Design a protein around this ligand. Structure first.
Ligand SMILES: Nc1ccn([C@H]2C[C@H](O)[C@@H](COP(=O)(O)OP(=O)(O)OP(=O)(O)O)O2)c(=O)n1
Ligand SMILES: [Ca+2]
Ligand SMILES: [Ca+2]
Ligand SMILES: [Ca+2]
Ligand SMILES: [Ca+2]
Ligand code: NA
Length: 1112
DNA sequence: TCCTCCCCTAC
DNA sequence: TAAGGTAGGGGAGGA
């Protein structure tokens, strides 16, 4: 009430912004006809490309706003407009008693009186309901409203009634007790409109008086006006900038391929000149300069320029977190209004959004969709990886000084950030997101930023809606859970399977010893015919009938196999192969028809197992019960500072908070008495997957899988292509290489979303929660990969295994690739080691119970066999190096290096080199070391070459760093560690990051550690002696402080007052670093060297005793 | 020697 | 207030 006044004032303000920027609210010509989408052209109205959409309140051309959505269009004529749909918000009440429905209808029609606009009886399929497969629907009351405000009040009015639900004791029930639950009450409005109306951003539409008519003719988006900007500010030495005090010394940016720079000459010592920055032909960048007087000349110039070009997309890089908020503040102090200026402002999440223009923050794409590791999510590494060139770097601390000192080069660097950001946006973020919008009921701002789980839920809501299925409410996690009287600390299911089986060096040129099992060779022979058939019909989708050389090929293989049976002990060059199941979990789901609503609790079939794993306290109910009364006797603080009541009973805390104390009180009691905090126990469990249920969920997974397989296909064609034709150099292909990066990126950017269909069943607030399904997917996978390993174990050596992949060696004698010939001359490709696995998967893991609706009207189901699980193969490779543990008998999982034959790095997994932070010495040393495994011409020769490098590095550290320039040394010895939260939120915890952060607070001021995500860069020191490692962490920033400053703290931290030497060398605990460098040499070189019968190739690093002992 | 925390990778 | 999952390496503390 009365707050519609607000939004209509605001909605109105937006309407003026939209008009300023070129979106006049357009209304289609009146027409009362019966148009056929066939004849769209005949119909009066405007054709536009939908580029955006937002919820707004609208004035009646009582007196309260009407809710609707503004849809932002670009038209075929290079213009823009916005059209508005209105649509009453709604949600449902569901009831226990089907019979008394009109009863409740009358109650609420009056009880809600004040806010209700309409009311109605509708029917939706509820999968929670018995025999809905026979056609039975749940009956609901559709509650509609004039605006979302009114809808919220209705919820407020039913809150009471709902909780209450959940006289003459010697005893026609009241209409209140029948209201069991409301439904679809938390669907965001604009989503509600996009789904029901079936409108998507990114699609073409003719706006007519009937509604939006999709023009399926138009292929290709329209070309919005894209601007990308990056700002540079003044920093203090060693500190973060402050919008409070510091100035925007420049603002570089691009607009449809044309650079601009805006300098603030109150900082820039000279009028900068127009210049060309063009990292590559594909990326031309000529800039124009707007040297401006002070801060505000630049600001206003910026805004004027936005207004001028009217951009629908403004892109940045972490602009939400830094760039925008800066600008905003510098705008206020200069007394400008940014909202009035260009119509941008922060939303409820502190993120900066406009109405007419999307703010595409590329960092969001990198974080979520790039599949890059966090250590490579900076604009430089992103640029290197995704753009293929080396961006300009500049030490942050020099950016201010160079403003005066070397201005033009500072300006050169700034345009680089923009060129990167702009072409990263246009080449990756733009197509991906906007295409994503064509299937997801979100606008670009949201399609870029929502969790992938949320992207999945949206898709599933469409699918459920269009099938007339009623949405389950969001799941809420339970307060506490028990197992055998024990309070469960945590519980889950056993995930994927991971094995480290062999360490060492493996090269296509160094023979390896094989111990083949003739038995296994037998089986492959007996299977061969049916397997070869499988490859043709299934893997390639043909018939053996059209096959020319099915028989030649069968013996080529057979000969080699037989040879291996007799000659089963051999010694030859290895084929270094990798096999990996394509979209494993999604295909396990779609194969077994796994979906949350198919898991029935005995009522009311495919039995599949999973493995539950609980982590519980050793204590029991009595001890649990005992602990509570003790806790009932205490006081706690009132969380809600909106009350003057400061002290709270235990029973007054939420059940939620209660359980926290109980846990932390019971954890200690457990410790003293039992005397462990957790017990873990694994229980095999079984579940029933009904095979006839509405497959709307699993169908959605299938649709999105197929969407990714295509990208995965042609990205294999261009990999396919490259290898032959364009590998002849000279060439500007190069282009083939550029296709692959772009497709593998698209297929990869789908990968996390796809696999989130699996994770979604486990997410908080999931509408489709099922732990059973998630467990079943994982146990099936574990079973499949262990079957594969067991086979390879017998015809080669598996080196490492993770969830759905095996790295292995096979003997060169093992049959590999062949081609089937057709009557048509076309050739079908076969990789026997792959297809040999796949035939076996399908023999054992096929779903023979898969059912489907052939006849919906007659409810007739047909049964058939489903299986879409396939290993695919890559390689063979030139080399794979695998680390080994320091602890005996244990290995290292999820770490290795693989090299192509052309000598390039195929894959680096897991190592510190790739990780964010870590000790830089180790990163560099690892960078150095791996390629050296490609040398020597014997095994021990290989370790020889690799040791030499080890020794140069040991030297540097034994040498106490005397060999190293000061600027180089300070780089190598740094360790960078990200604090995930803020220092304060760690209280009672000891870490090198904490200490460093602490000290970085005093040296520079608590303004340094205010925010989250602080990068603590530190060294270890010898002094104070004896002090635990977490105590000797020193902020590298000190050695850049002016001397008097460095003294006090060095003195303060070293805990020795006398000291007056300030060389970083005097400080460093070299014994620390020699040792961390030694552990790496051990795991990566010497200990793997051992396991292959090679004496310690780096004797300056001594074996572990246990490994010495094993020597004898 | 083991567990536990945290960050960040691998699936 | 919005929010996919589990398995693992390894540094560092302490039971
Ligand atoms: N971000 C990820 C990566 C993987 N997985 C789970 C589900 C995957 O199916 C399984 C296998 O990992 P892959 O990396 O092998 O994933 P796919 O098999 O799904 O991908 P590809 O088609 O590249 O083989 O692990 C996951 O849940 N989330
Ligand atoms: Ca920036
Ligand atoms: Ca896979
Ligand atoms: Ca894999
Ligand atoms: Ca671990
Ligand atoms: Na390692």
């Amino acid at each position: 009430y009365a707050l519609s006044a607000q939004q209509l004032l605001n909605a109105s303000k937006i309407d003026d912004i939209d008009s300023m920027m070129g979106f006049e609210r357009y209304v289609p010509p009146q027409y009362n006809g019966r148009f056929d989408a066939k004849d769209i052209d005949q119909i009066p109205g405007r054709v536009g490309w939908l580029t955006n959409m937002h919820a707004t309140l609208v004035s009646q051309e009582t007196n309260q706003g009407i809710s609707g959505v503004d849809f932002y269009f670009l038209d075929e004529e290079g213009g823009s407009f916005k059209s508005t749909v209105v649509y009453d918000p709604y949600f449902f009440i569901a009831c226990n008693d089907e019979s008394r429905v009109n009863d409740v209808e009358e109650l609420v029609k009056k009880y809600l009186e004040s806010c209700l606009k309409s009311l109605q009886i509708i029917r939706k399929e509820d999968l929670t309901m018995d025999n809905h497969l026979l056609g039975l629907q749940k009956t609901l009351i559709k509650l509609s409203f004039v605006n979302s405000n009114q809808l919220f009040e209705a919820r407020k009015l039913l809150r009471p009634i709902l909780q209450d639900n959940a006289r003459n004791i010697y005893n026609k029930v009241d209409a209140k007790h029948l209201i069991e639950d409301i439904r679809e009450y938390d669907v965001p409005y604009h989503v509600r409109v996009s789904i029901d109306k079936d409108i998507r951003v990114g699609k073409w539409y003719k706006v007519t008086q009937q509604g939006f008519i999709e023009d399926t003719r138009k292929i290709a988006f329209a070309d919005p006006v894209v601007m990308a900007f990056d700002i540079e500010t003044t920093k203090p030495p060693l500190k973060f900038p402050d919008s409070a005090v510091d100035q925007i010394m420049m603002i570089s940016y691009m607009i449809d391929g044309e650079g601009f720079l805006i300098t603030n000459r109150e900082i820039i010592s000279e009028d900068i000149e127009d210049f060309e920055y063009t990292p590559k032909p594909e990326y031309p960048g000529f800039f124009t300069i707007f040297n401006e007087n002070d801060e505000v000349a630049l600001l206003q110039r910026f805004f004027e320029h936005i207004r001028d070009v009217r951009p629908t997309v403004i892109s940045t890089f972490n602009g939400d977190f830094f760039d925008w908020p800066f600008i905003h503040n510098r705008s206020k102090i200069h007394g400008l209004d940014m909202f009035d200026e260009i119509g941008f402002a922060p939303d409820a999440e502190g993120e900066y959004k406009s109405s007419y223009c999307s703010h595409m923050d590329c960092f969001r794409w990198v974080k979520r969709d790039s599949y890059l590791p966090q250590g490579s999510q900076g604009l430089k590494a992103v640029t290197q990886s995704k753009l293929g060139y080396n961006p300009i770097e500049l030490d942050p601390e020099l950016m201010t000084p160079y403003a005066f000192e070397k201005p033009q080069h500072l300006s050169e660097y700034s345009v680089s950030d923009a060129v990167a950001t702009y072409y990263l946006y246009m080449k990756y973020v733009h197509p991906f997101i906007f295409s994503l919008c064509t299937i997801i009921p979100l606008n670009p701002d949201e399609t870029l930023r929502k969790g992938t789980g949320t992207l999945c839920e949206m898709l599933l809501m469409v699918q459920a809606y269009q099938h007339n299925i009623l949405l389950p409410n969001k799941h809420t996690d339970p307060i506490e859970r028990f197992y055998d009287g024990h309070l469960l600390e945590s519980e889950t299911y056993v995930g994927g399977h991971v094995e480290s089986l062999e360490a060492g060096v493996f090269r296509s040129d160094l023979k390896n010893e094989f111990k083949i099992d003739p038995s296994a060779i037998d089986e492959l022979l007996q299977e061969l015919p049916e397997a070869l058939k499988f490859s043709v019909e299934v893997e390639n989708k043909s018939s053996v009938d059209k096959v020319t050389n099915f028989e030649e090929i069968k013996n080529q293989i057979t000969q080699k196999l037989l040879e291996l049976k007799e000659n089963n002990i051999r010694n030859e060059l290895p084929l270094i192969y990798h096999v990996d199941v394509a979209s494993m979990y999604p295909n396990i789901m779609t194969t077994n028809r796994l979906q949350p609503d198919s898991i029935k609790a005995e009522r009311d079939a495919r039995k599949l197992k999973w493995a539950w794993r609980g982590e519980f306290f050793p204590s029991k109910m009595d001890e649990y019960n005992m602990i509570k009364r003790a806790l009932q006797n205490e006081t706690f603080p009132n969380k809600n500072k909106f009350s003057k009541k400061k002290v709270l009973t235990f029973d007054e805390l939420s059940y939620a908070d209660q359980v926290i104390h109980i846990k932390k009180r019971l954890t200690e009691y457990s410790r003293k008495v039992y005397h462990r905090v957790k017990v873990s126990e694994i229980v095999e469990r079984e579940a029933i997957v009904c095979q006839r249920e509405n497959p709307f969920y699993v169908d959605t997974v299938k649709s999105f899988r197929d969407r990714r397989y295509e990208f995965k296909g042609l990205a294999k064609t261009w990999k396919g292509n490259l290898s032959k034709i364009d590998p002849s150099d000279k060439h500007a292909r190069d282009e083939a290489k550029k296709m692959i990066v772009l497709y593998d990126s698209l297929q990869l950017a789908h990968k996390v979303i796809l696999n989130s269909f699996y994770g979604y069943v486990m997410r908080k607030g999931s509408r489709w929660y099922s732990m059973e399904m998630a467990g079943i997917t994982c146990l099936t996978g574990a079973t499949i990969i262990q079957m594969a390993r067991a086979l390879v174990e017998r015809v080669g050596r598996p080196l490492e295994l993770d969830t759905d992949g095996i790295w292995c060696i096979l003997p060169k004698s093992f049959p590999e690739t062949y081609f089937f010939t057709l009557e048509n001359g076309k050739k079908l490709y076969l990789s026997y080691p792959c297809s040999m696995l796949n035939y076996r998967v399908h023999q054992k893991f096929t779903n023979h119970q898969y059912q489907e609706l052939k006849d919906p009207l007659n409810y007739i189901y047909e049964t058939h066999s489903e299986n879409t699980i396939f290993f695919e193969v890559d390689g063979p490779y030139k080399a794979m190096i695998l680390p080994s543990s320091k602890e005996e008998g244990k290995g290292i999982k999820k770490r290795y290096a693989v090299f192509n034959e052309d000598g390039s790095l195929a894959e680096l997994k897991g190592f510190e080199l790739k990780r964010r932070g870590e000790l830089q010495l180790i990163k560099n040393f690892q960078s150095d070391i791996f390629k050296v495994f490609l040398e020597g011409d014997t095994l021990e020769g290989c370790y020889s070459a690799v040791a030499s490098v080890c020794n140069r590095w040991l030297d540097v550290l034994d040498s106490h760093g005397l060999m190293l320039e000061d600027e180089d040394l300070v780089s190598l010895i740094c360790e960078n560690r990200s604090m995930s939260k803020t220092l304060k939120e760690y209280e009672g915890q000891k870490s090198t990051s904490i200490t460093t952060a602490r000290r970085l607070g005093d040296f520079l001021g608590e303004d340094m550690v205010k925010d989250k995500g602080l990068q603590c860069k530190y060294i270890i020191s010898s002094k104070p002696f004896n002090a635990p490692v977490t105590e000797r962490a020193i902020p590298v920033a000190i050695f850049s402080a002016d001397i008097p400053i460095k003294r006090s703290f060095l003195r303060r931290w070293t805990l020795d007052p006398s000291l007056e030497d300030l060389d970083i060398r005097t400080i460093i605990d070299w014994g620390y670093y020699r040792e961390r460098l030694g552990s790496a040499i051990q795991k990566i070189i010497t200990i793997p060297a051992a396991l292959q019968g090679v004496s310690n190739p780096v004797p300056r690093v001594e074996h572990p005793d246990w490994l010495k002992r094993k020597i004898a």
